[PDB]
Amino acid sequence: SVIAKQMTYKVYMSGTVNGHYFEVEGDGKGKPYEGEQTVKLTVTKGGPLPFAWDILSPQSSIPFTKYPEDIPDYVKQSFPEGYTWERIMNFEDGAVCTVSNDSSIQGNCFIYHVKFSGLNFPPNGPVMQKKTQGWEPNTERLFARDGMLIGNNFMALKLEGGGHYLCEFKSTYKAKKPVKMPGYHYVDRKLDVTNHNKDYTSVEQCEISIARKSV
Amino acid sequence: SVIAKQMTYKVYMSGTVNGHYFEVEGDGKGKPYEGEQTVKLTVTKGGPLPFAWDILSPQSSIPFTKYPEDIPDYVKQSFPEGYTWERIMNFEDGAVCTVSNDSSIQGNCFIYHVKFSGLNFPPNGPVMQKKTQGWEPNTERLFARDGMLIGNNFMALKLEGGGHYLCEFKSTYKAKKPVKMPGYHYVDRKLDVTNHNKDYTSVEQCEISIARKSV
Ligand SMILES: [Cl-]
Ligand SMILES: [Cl-]
Ligand SMILES: [Cl-]
Ligand SMILES: [Cl-]
Ligand SMILES: [Cl-]
Ligand SMILES: [Cl-]
Numbered sequence: 394s395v396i397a398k399q400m401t402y403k404v405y406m407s408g409t410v411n412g413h414y415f416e417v418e419g420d421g422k423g424k425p426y427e428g429e430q431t432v433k434l435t436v437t438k439g440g441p442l443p444f445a446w447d448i449l450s451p452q453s454s455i456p457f458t459k460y461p462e463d464i465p466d467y468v469k470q471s472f473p474e475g476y477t478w479e480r481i482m483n484f485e486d487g488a489v490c491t492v493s494n495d496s497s498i499q500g501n502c503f504i505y506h507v508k509f510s511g512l513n514f515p516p517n518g519p520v521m522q523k524k525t526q527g528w529e530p531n532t533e534r535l536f537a538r539d540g541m542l543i544g545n546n547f548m549a550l551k552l553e554g555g556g557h558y559l560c561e562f563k564s565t566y567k568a569k570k571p572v573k574m575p576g577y578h579y580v581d582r583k584l585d586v587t588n589h590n591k592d593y594t595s596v597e598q599c600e601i602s603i604a605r606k607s608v
Numbered sequence: 609s610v611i612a613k614q615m616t617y618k619v620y621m622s623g624t625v626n627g628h629y630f631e632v633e634g635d636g637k638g639k640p641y642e643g644e645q646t647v648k649l650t651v652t653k654g655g656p657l658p659f660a661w662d663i664l665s666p667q668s669s670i671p672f673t674k675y676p677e678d679i680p681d682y683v684k685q686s687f688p689e690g691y692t693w694e695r696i697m698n699f700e701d702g703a704v705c706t707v708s709n710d711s712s713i714q715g716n717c718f719i720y721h722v723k724f725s726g727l728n729f730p731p732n733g734p735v736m737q738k739k740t741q742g743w744e745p746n747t748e749r750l751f752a753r754d755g756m757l758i759g760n761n762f763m764a765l766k767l768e769g770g771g772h773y774l775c776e777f778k779s780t781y782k783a784k785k786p787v788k789m790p791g792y793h794y795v796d797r798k799l800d801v802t803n804h805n806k807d808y809t810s811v812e813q814c815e816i817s818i819a820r821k822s823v
Contacts, residue, residue: 529792529822530822530823531749531822532747532749532794532823534746534747534762534764536764536772538771538772545762545774546762547749547760547761547762549751549792556753557751557792559760561760577744577764577772581822581823603823605823607744607745607746607796608745608747608796608818608820608823
């Protein structure tokens with residue numbers, strides 16, 4: 394396979410949030426067959442960001458998902474040709490983000506190019522006031538349709554003071570060549586910001602992702 | 609506690625689907641602390657139903673959910689006063705259902721009164737053409753807000769021929785008196801039609817529901 398037991402990745406992300414332009418670059422590493430990975434991000438343009446970092450954390454790596462042998466692994470099969478993904482994030486206060494990725498491979502390093510567009514975040518809401526405290530551990534429902542893998546997730550951000558701020562994800566993963574399609578299944582994830590500087594111009598994230606066929 | 613290790617229930621359900629009125633009565637039993645239950649339904653008015661039975665199967669019992677000791681059990685705590693629930697089902701082809709319940713207790717028997725309103729099912733879609741083949745095993749995301757328990761579930765019906773027909777649930781459970789609120793958690797369920805007659809005027813269902821605090 395072109396996917397080694399230890400791999401690196403490079404992320405080039407750019408976008409807007411309520412009209413504010415930014416660029417981010419990241420250096421990641423992980424164990425694709427263990428579903429373990431980490432990434433170090435730097436804001437390279439438009440920093441310090443005037444919005445919560447948490448809306449960007451799920452946008453910087455599906456090859457690093459642990460798949461049991463009896464569940465086809467859509468994204469690993471897509472390489473070396475690679476894949477793209479598209480995502481809609483619908484927040485409960487009306488904000489909407491559209492995110493797209495292109496993923497390729499060069500040797501032992503995946504290359505991700507990400508475009509992020511977020512808007513209608515209320516100026517006094519938790520994203521513009523930076524009151525979020527990370528995503529709850531979560532489960533993505535996945536199934537195959539028309540050669541694409543479609544995921545849906547009822548996500549939530551923890552808030553300063555104890556509440557939750559809800560977000561619905563719809564993710565569409567598109568392999569660049571046909572692959573063996575999986576059945577109806579789930580992916581459980583833990584995604585955490587494990588380090589950052591005062592203004593989130595440098596951020597470190599760790600993610601564990603494990604696929605399964607229902608409890 | 610007023611909830612015994614073995615209990616029964618009676619269901620009185622009525623409603624409309626694309627303007628077609630019906631009534632259903634059910635007799636259920638289960639082990640509330642094991643999350644195990646079964647129910648036998650009879651269509652008492654408006655039968656045979658011109659729509660897929662599956663849209664009604666999740667509307668006939670939250671007391672029968674296995675809760676670990678370290679997760680407060682919102683619905684069991686609500687008794688003997690009881691609780692109500694409200695549900696919105698949004699199907700991917702535009703159909704929408706609104707469902708409400710009132711649940712009370714009389715001795716060893718819970719009493720459920722259910723009102724179902726479903727509409728905009730396309731006449732050539734899988735519900736009106738009876739092409740559904742049961743719900744996939746699923747996971748409800750649950751959290752506490754304003755004294756209510758709010759659940760969300762990315763559900764799917766299996767289809768004749770191999771596809772899936774998606775439905776999003778939003779359920780709101782409302783205890784009639786204040787109870788100890790749980791943290792952010794999940795409930796996994798298997799719900800199956802285990803017997804039926806030719807025209808689904810008699811149906812038997814079995815459900816296993818188990819709460820947990822993330823994999
Ligand atoms: Cl790692
Ligand atoms: Cl497919
Ligand atoms: Cl850092
Ligand atoms: Cl039982
Ligand atoms: Cl609350
Ligand atoms: Cl039967």
